[PDB]
Structure formats: structure tokens, C-alpha cells
Design a protein around this nucleic acid. Structure first.
Ligand code: CL
Ligand code: MG
Lengths: 267, 276
DNA sequence: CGACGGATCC
DNA sequence: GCTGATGCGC
DNA sequence: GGATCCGTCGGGCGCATCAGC
């Protein structure tokens, strides 16, 4: 039932040391997450890049503590005009854009060797009320990512709001008709991997590892039972797999109903 | 007439010793400047804080020697987004600043790489590469609008902390601030609009021109010389680069230097000594 | 943008 | 990869 | 007529892009 992420491999298959550390966190209430000492974990993880999803915080209400990360001094925010995302970078991105070209869910940062996308994929909702909107969003998102990656290697991170396979969640049989494990959402994630193309960094390295989740409902004490879902991903262009050192699930960092995830790249 | 910067005054008027040395340099292309040995001057100057303008270089392309600067290990870089190769500012600090921010309000959408704000314990340092009004003044109005947005931005800094504004403000404030005031009144850097904009910056914020406060009547003191026509050798130049201080800081002012002899750009470095 | 040439000032 | 032309802005 | 004013003009630099190879 319960899961322990393996230690960080900071060396590429070919032996190159990790030069790039990306953390992504659905903080599910940036302000609450700040109060729950979220920045303490950021300061400790010291990523080169931090992606936040479901911030639920207008730009003009962003806490002042965020200005106290000179190590992530380039901060970009996208507000929803129940979402919101942030991208914080140590180095100055070459260019930063918002949305999928077409609700505050996607930021795109261009760097030297790759393009970073963070995404807060829309939840299909209780009773699947927004499943269809999710299905359209998935296709539009797939389309959008295809063009990006047809110009530069791609890292896609964030809350993709789908458990790809049964191994990616605790109770597949009871969730095959809930948001995040519908055949439609699962198909969309499979299409996303196939069509872009992209590799599930974590699953590429831990193909056989069960019980590794990134989200647990606040309710029923799901997190302490590790009754959860892997909803947060680092997806990678195949051309970046040689640089892949590790893809972590930070199961024990608190402050949200998601835990953070961490990517290591030898770039 | 040639100019010789007076010796470094390292003690305040009241006798208090300088504790903070800030250099500012428009390096006119950071990769060029390093290959013309600009970093040798930085190591000789050994400033606590180095602000650079016109880095013309995105962060991925910073030369490795810039990591070989152990006394300036906290490095903050900003390059424009559509116009890489132009602008670009850098702030390098011995100590780590409490807060760093970029731009003057909406850099996450502007992404101009002209302005770096760094808050330290006792003050707020802004370095700016102020947009040039252009040949034929074609971007003067944008420069007037920028000036006003910058004024209001500097005004609305939510710190009681005194302010240090440094860098290439891209205007000779008064006639004493360039060699040819009359023939340049319609040239970028010396229009009434930019001069008034400078004057309103000092009055609005409010700020004092550190060098001019110490050397109110000293002429021929410039920080920029066009590469063309051996202007520098003739010391036909402009004072474009400044240290501007909140009034609270003046008694802490020991000296504002023009490092006329340092080569490697068409600007020379300026240096502030503060007794903090 | 400083050099240059040409006009204007007394 | 490298040079040097061109373009653009300073 | 020396000084001064004023408008025009050629051009040094750095870096991106592009063509060529
Ligand atoms: Cl930076
Ligand atoms: Mg310049």
C-alpha cells in the first residue's frame, strides 16, 4: 500500500551530472500553501525551476514571501480571468508565454536546450460534468504541444489530472467512471504520449513500480493510507531521455492534497 | 579639455568610512566586453555590487569566466525576450539580496530586461538601462512614457528603505553633462523631454545626482563617448550613467567616481562609495 | 553624434 | 562550423 | 570677420541572421 520514492539519481545513463532541477507542485491554494510552509520546501529543494498549479490567487494578491526567493527570481503567473499557475525560474528564460495559443492553466518558458510547459489540466469534475470540456482541452493541448516540440525538445510538467494506467492509482476498478480514470481521459493521455511524442519520465524509469501517487483526497485520510493517484507528471521529448537522471515523487512534502514532483536533467 | 577624476574619497563628509562599493557599467555587449578584458577591471575594482547594462546576452550564453567571480556569486540577469542581442541588464552581488525583481511592473509580459530591483538590508538598489530615444528621436515618446512609468514605479516602491538608482539613464541632465550641449539639444540623450524627465525623476521620487552633488561645478566629466571619430581620446563625451540616491543617503555618500580610464565599452564604469 | 559647411550676429 | 555580409540599434 | 548657430552627413561598435561552403 504505502510508497517510498527511491533516492535521487543525479547522473545520466551516460554518466553526465544533472545540471537542471525542476520541481512542479499543485499547491491547491497558493496562499494556504504559503501559510503551510510550502516555500520552506522550495527553499530546501532549491530547484532551478518551480512550477505551481491551482494557485487560486490573483496576481495582485500574491503573498510577499514569494519575493523572498532570489534563487527563483524570475516569476511568471497566469490567473484564470479555480485554477492559476506559476513558473519560477533561477535563470532568465529566453521567452515566456501563456495559454495554449487558442483560463490560467498553462505557462510556456523557453530555455536554451528545451521548452518547459507547465499545465494545470482541467479536472473532469464530480459526476463528469466537465468531462467534455476536458476532452476538448486535451485535444487542443495535444495539438498545441505538437508544434512546440516540432521546434525544440519539450518538458511538460504539472497536474495532468489523469492516471494513465491502473498502476497509476490505488482503486482503478472503482474509478473507471470518475474524473481522472475515465477511458476518455486515459485515452487522451495515451494520445498525448503517442502524438507529440512524449515519454512519462517517471514511468520510463519505474515501469514496474506500483503505489506511487502524487494526489490524495483530503478526505477519508486517503493520504495516510496512500489511497491516491499519480496525476502530476514530467513528460519529456524522447530526445531528452539521454539527459533524464531522475523523476521524483516527493511523497512526504505537505501543504496541499498534491505532493511535489522533481525532475533531474543532465543538460 | 581632458578630465582626471579626483582621487577616491572613501570617507563621508562626517568622517564615516565607506562600507559598500557599487560599480555600474554599460558594457556595450557583455561578450565583447569580456573579451576586451572588462572582467579584469571588475576584479581590480572589487566592487560589492556590480550592475551592468547592455549585456546584449541571454543567460544561457554568459561566458564561463562570469562564474569565476567568487566575490560576486549572486548573479541576476535579465534579457529582453523578442529583442535578444539588445538591452540586457545584470546585477552581481557579493551578498545575496533579500529580494530580486525585474522590470517596472509587468516584466512577466513585457520581458524588457532593462531593470533589476534588488532589496538589501539597508537599501533598495535599482539598476536601469533606460530606453534610448533613438537616432532622429524616433522612440523619444516611448522614452517619455517609459520615464513616467519608471518614475511612478520608483515612487511606488513599497519600502521605507532608501533607494539607490544606478546605471545608464541615457540622458545628460544639464549642459555641463556633455561636451557639446548646443549641437546635441535635438539628439537622443539631451532633449528637453529627457532632461525634464530626469529633473522630474529627481523631484518626484525624490533623488539626488550623487556625482553632481559632490562636484556641482566640475565640467568635462563624462561616462560615455561615441566610438566614432576618436571622441573618447578627445574627451568629447556625455554623462549618461549615474548613481541617484534618496536624500536620506547623502550623509552616507563618500564619493561618486567616473572610471574614465577603464576601456572595453563606449561607456566607462562609475563607482559609488557609501558609508552604511 | 561629432565633424562639417554654410548662414547669422555685430 | 566558420566567415563575413547585411540589418539594426546604440 | 571670429564666434556662434544650425542642419546634414558619414560612421564606429556589438550582435542576430543569413548565405555560402
Ligand atoms: Cl538570473
Ligand atoms: Mg550603447
Amino acid at each position: 500500500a504505502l510508497y517510498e520514492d527511491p533516492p535521487d539519481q543525479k547522473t545520466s545513463p551516460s554518466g553526465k551530472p544533472a545540471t537542471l532541477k525542476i520541481a512542479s507542485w499543485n499547491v491547491d491554494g497558493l496562499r494556504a500553501w504559503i501559510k503551510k510552509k510550502g516555500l520552506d520546501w522550495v527553499k530546501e529543494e532549491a530547484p532551478d525551476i518551480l512550477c505551481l498549479q491551482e494557485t487560486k490567487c490573483s496576481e495582485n494578491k500574491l503573498p510577499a514571501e514569494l519575493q523572498e526567493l532570489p534563487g527563483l527570481s524570475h516569476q511568471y503567473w497566469s490567473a484564470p480571468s479555480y485554477s492559476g499557475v506559476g513558473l519560477l525560474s533561477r535563470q532568465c528564460p529566453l521567452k515566456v508565454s501563456y495559454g495554449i495559443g487558442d483560463e490560467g492553466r498553462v505557462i510556456v518558458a523557453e530555455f536554451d536546450s528545451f521548452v518547459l510547459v507547465t499545465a494545470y489540466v482541467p479536472n473532469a469534475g464530480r459526476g463528469l460534468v466537465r468531462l467534455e470540456y476536458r476532452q476538448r482541452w486535451d485535444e487542443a493541448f495535444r495539438k498545441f504541444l505538437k508544434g512546440l516540440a516540432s521546434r525544440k525538445p519539450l518538458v511538460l510538467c504539472g497536474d495532468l489530472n489523469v492516471a494513465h494506467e491502473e498502476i497509476d492509482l490505488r482503486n482503478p476498478k472503482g474509478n473507471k467512471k470518475n474524473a481522472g480514470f475515465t477511458p476518455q481521459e486515459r485515452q487522451g493521455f495515451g494520445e498525448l504520449l503517442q502524438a507529440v511524442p512524449l515519454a512519462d519520465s517517471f514511468r520510463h524509469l519505474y515501469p514496474n513500480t506500483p503505489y506511487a501517487y502524487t494526489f490524495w483526497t483530503y478526505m477519508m485520510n486517503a493520504r495516510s493510507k496512500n489511497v491516491g493517484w499519480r496525476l502530476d507528471y514530467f513528460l519529456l521529448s524522447h530526445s531528452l531521455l539521454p539527459a533524464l537522471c531522475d523523476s521524483k515523487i516527493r511523497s512526504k512534502a505537505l501543504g496541499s492534497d498534491h505532493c511535489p514532483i522533481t525532475l533531474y536533467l543532465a543538460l
